[PDB]
Point group: C4
Chain length 326, copies 4
């Protein structure tokens, strides 16, 4: 019964687990960081910059794509402005570009202009992916544009992952409540500790032979490899990339120290009705994206050498974790 | 044996659990927040202001009732003064009003005057509801006034909930030691982590077809929905409402910042013999109650949309939680 | 095998548990706080002041005994001086008095002089009670003085409790590493979380029909009732009593605030070779012992009313706990 | 399946466990602290100073050996300079000396010069011992120099311990991520909580009849005895010894207080490509090594008396632990 099972489930977060070292014949410099997200999308590094207004526009998307990654242009701008940002990326050496779409009335014209601008991947980006409004949008976007790779989310269960893959999504984005700037857990009382969310969703994805994006809660390079080893094909970063020069924000000074503004897409300012589910704050200026990425991938490479993971397929399928206390 | 089972039980609090997101066809704006506490009592929002001297008098009770909620007038005043506070609420558009009663000698005349003043619900409010003094009072008040909805508490077990429902209570109030200002755990060594207390008591309540009030420990809107999803029909708030203008306290200033006094009904000052089980302190001035309630219900609505809970019956009966570590 | 079972055991401390409230017909004022520690020793309150140099001498022992408790005169003084301290207590209205004895050469003459001074209970007080030196001393002291109540400790297992009771002890004192000023856990890597230590030792004591003293780690009145409900007949306090006027220390002033010195009997200063296992520090001046005791017993009474424990026998045998997280 | 077992393993650290006190006929002064690491290597105390540049050179190695211990001369210097440091130790009364070797090209000439200088034990010191590069080096060094005691590591599993012992190692060094200055867990996402790592590796070592070194994470004397009781034959210290006069660092002054530099062998400065896995910081000046060791062994002796461990064989094989919460 539903009553009896209320408190049955146990979930894990990044800080609850560590990768166990294993037999390795491969050096960190020699590991393969590439991942196939779909038939058309192949990334050299498993990192995607977040579809947020304090994180990704053309400057971030170009820089990300030049590192072998990908950037999701945020939808908190006009249809034309978004298509123009997509154009800048494509005109920068035919770089892979992703763009965010919602469920609202404006989606129909937005998706056409983005596809027209030469977008590679469309991202149905919502707070609650396990909904009718989102399922219908997935069916619609996939019927209208079958050549464009479709990402749909956010979800945190196997049932939600099943339903999105069945509706027509190519990639499912996982994460409900783990984000650094997220207040959903405290406001709505809802969330799935991210390691369990990734694992439960990837368990389902493995059946469909499809990819998942581990979105939110990544604090360091160690969280990146843990997110991939739990089942994620690629990770999505907000906090770790917001402080870089390439993020759309303006560099500010406060008591000598250089800072950049980072906020939730559900914060008061970003929403400009729904009660806020995100915060707005300050994050230290990081410098060039390229240097942030190099440090992050260095740590991921170190971990793949420790686990004897020659590639990401060997990490996702074979790497073992140990649970531990605080 | 009693000896062998000493440490058998495991209990959970709000911070130990989160609601798992589920299939949803309903938007937060569209969810139904109403709850039937008894045949005569129907609330538009599942919130009740606490029967405390730094929380509820006529000003709080009117404001609460105008939001679709309910206020429990505290019993730390004279019989006539209490009846007059009840009168003010009833004379304010026939608003639903609740009033607190004890077990002491003065209860007999107090209950008559409150009923005379047009009270809708009587609350036998004690520290230890699983007692002979309380069982007898429930039988007495229900025989004398069968038309008035009777709330009895506080309890934290199924056995206590059974005994109150059998004695004649319509609603059982759950909470032993979780209150923000409570020191019972540290003083008396007694308590039941509130999520388990609600669930164990609601498991019993479901058999009798009766309602339970989740009383104490609520820090944010996320704790409200967790308390309801664990089995509570409505929640009781102290701390979250004490800082509002409508609370009986006087607005004070200390080093520029505006504060309001909030104290336990078992603190030294409130008791004015029993050793203190509550603290007296300062809480930031919140402003209008109406705005505090709107933010709180906004978060509860967000959570009901995440879980696909069209109403509170679907939340209490079907919503699933995950346990997690610190 | 010993190898396979290395990490089998799980242990609990005070902060891991709470008493579950139960059916109660008794009020806190009406509960019985008396306990029979032996055929000759009957205490009105289950509290014993610690056999420490910053805690108990004649002034503490008299004050303790006048509250219905007991004081253990420390052995960090001359034989004659100790006997004189015992005399002062006996000459103060025939008050019950306890005195500490070791295992060293001086024990033989010390025990005779203390018995001569009219001591009621002798305490073989050691860091490691589960030893040959201690077993032999128990046999010796019990053969030589069969009319004097013998306490032996400290221990933290059933096997140790069995061996002391079999050697001739009347009461076994439980506690290895829980003391507020103790550093044994960090220095020696040894300890048994105190709730489990009490329960495991009391499980053994129940077979012999004998009493146990829950010694160390008590921070508040809630820890007192938890220690008794876990199986302890009486508790021993260091930290909670050291700040009182009756403790042998001198009242000092530091930056306006009044303090008293409290130290481990295994600290550098107290030892005046063994590496230190205790710390020396400052504790706030508490005032009169009588007031400290009244507050503490008030909390214990509150808890006995919550659990429906009319007496300590009903607490120790029937009271149930719940485990919980941080 | 590998997928299903991803989160099966549970691991423990020092802070998760305590030694249970047991029947003891031995006093701390009387316990035997000696350990046989190999046929040729016998230590009077189970302590080895770390093969680090802010910890061990000739001055540390001589002082360690004079306490009955051992020092591993670090390999972050020239071949001749290392052999000269080894010479100074041997010329200081034929004291036991250990020296670090890697897997790199320079290893072949380095190992010859160290053996020529009269080294007793060679240490193949790596970040990831469960590798082909390390297995091959073990086979090579053991074939070329069968008279010199070979230590190989670092590892954290039974499989890794098996493979090193089979390749020709005499002693396996255990520790992946527990070091005070280590950032591997946060950078690479890899680690095995040290108590479990020691126990899992020693379970394997017991089959081969060989010794293991518990390396890293030791904060106090309590962690030393816990590391040995979990299966370690001897411990390796970095942090605890870095502040002593005998460490190669220079004594510095900062705001009155005396400090010494302590850094990871994977920190930026020490590496002078791999991303850093260690930090560089300041540690308080401790004084003479001899005094640090005396305090540490005093605590280990206290613990062996509590557990009735007459020797280290009785500790490793019979001592029992209890798990506990935070
Ligand atoms: C106001 C709030 N705004 C956002 C915006 C962007 C987000 N982006 C990612 C994530 C979340 C986000 C929340 C929350 C869950 O974690 C991932 C939001 O839309 N609330 C909401 C609540 C319930 C339902 Cl049914 N629909 C929507
Ligand atoms: C002094 C103390 N005062 C209060 C007052 C209001 C309360 N209101 C709610 C709650 C508690 C309260 C305690 C404590 C448990 O959590 C809920 C109280 O009456 N102690 C008490 C102890 C044992 C028994 Cl048999 N009877 C009464
Ligand atoms: C130096 C240290 N001094 C004390 C003094 C008083 C104590 N009083 C109570 C307790 C402890 C105490 C330790 C430690 C355990 O918790 C209770 C002590 O004697 N160490 C010790 C170690 C091993 C063995 Cl075989 N024998 C003795
Ligand atoms: C840069 C990093 N430097 C060090 C240096 C000394 C160490 N010494 C002891 C330990 C560790 C150490 C790491 C890390 C694990 O804990 C014990 C290192 O070499 N990374 C590394 C990563 C993966 C692989 Cl396949 N190979 C090497
Ligand atoms: O306001 C918000 N509430 C909750 N989650 C958010 C909000 N805005 C963005 N997110 C999520 O948080 C992620 C970033 O997480 P981070 O990398 O930990 O900062 C984004 O990629 C979104 O999925
Ligand atoms: O002094 C007291 N001791 C213990 N609980 C108290 C005391 N006074 C009130 N309470 C409870 O605490 C609740 C308020 O909890 P809060 O909303 O967390 O502040 C009240 O509704 C009472 O049930
Ligand atoms: O130096 C010491 N090391 C360890 N335990 C000690 C020491 N001195 C006294 N104790 C114990 O600590 C108890 C006091 O604990 P407290 O009430 O938590 O301060 C005493 O009654 C002794 O059993
Ligand atoms: O940079 C590094 N990263 C990780 N571990 C390190 C590093 N340098 C040394 N170690 C390990 O840390 C141990 C010292 O640990 P400690 O005694 O806790 O400071 C050394 O003996 C090495 O095994």
């Amino acid at each position: 019964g539903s009553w009896e099972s209320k408190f049955a489930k146990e979930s894990l977060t990044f800080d609850d687990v560590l990768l166990i070292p294993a037999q390795s014949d491969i050096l960190p410099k020699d590991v393969d960081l590439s991942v196939q997200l779909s038939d058309k999308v192949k990334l050299n590094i498993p990192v995607i910059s977040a579809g947020m207004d304090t994180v990704t526009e053309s400057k971030m998307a170009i820089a990300m794509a030049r590192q072998g990654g990908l950037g999701v242009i945020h939808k908190n701008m006009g249809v034309e402005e978004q298509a123009d940002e997509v154009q800048k990326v494509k005109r920068s050496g035919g770089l892979l570009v992703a763009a965010a779409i919602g469920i609202s009335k404006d989606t129909d014209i937005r998706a056409q202009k983005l596809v027209e601008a030469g977008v590679d991947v469309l991202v149905i980006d919502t707070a609650h992916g396990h909904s009718k409004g989102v399922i219908d949008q997935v069916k619609h976007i996939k019927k209208t544009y079958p050549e464009i790779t479709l990402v749909a989310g956010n979800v945190a269960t196997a049932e939600a992952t099943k339903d999105l893959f069945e509706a027509g999504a190519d990639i499912v984005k996982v994460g409900i409540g783990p984000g650094s700037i997220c207040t959903t857990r405290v406001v709505a009382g809802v969330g799935v500790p991210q390691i369990t969310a990734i694992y439960d969703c990837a368990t389902e994805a493995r059946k469909h032979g499809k990819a998942i994006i581990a979105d939110g809660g990544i604090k360091f390079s160690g969280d990146i490899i843990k997110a991939l080893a739990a089942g994620g094909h690629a990770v999505m970063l907000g906090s770790l990339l917001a402080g870089t020069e390439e993020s759309p924000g303006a560099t500010e000074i406060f008591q000598g120290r250089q800072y950049k503004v980072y906020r939730g897409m559900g914060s008061l300012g970003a929403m400009e009705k729904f009660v806020p589910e995100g915060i707005e704050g300050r994050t230290a200026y990081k410098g060039a994206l390229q240097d942030t990425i190099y440090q992050l991938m260095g740590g991921v490479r170190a971990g793949m050498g420790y686990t004897g993971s020659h590639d990401l397929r060997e990490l996702r399928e074979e790497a073992q974790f140990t649970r531990m206390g605080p």
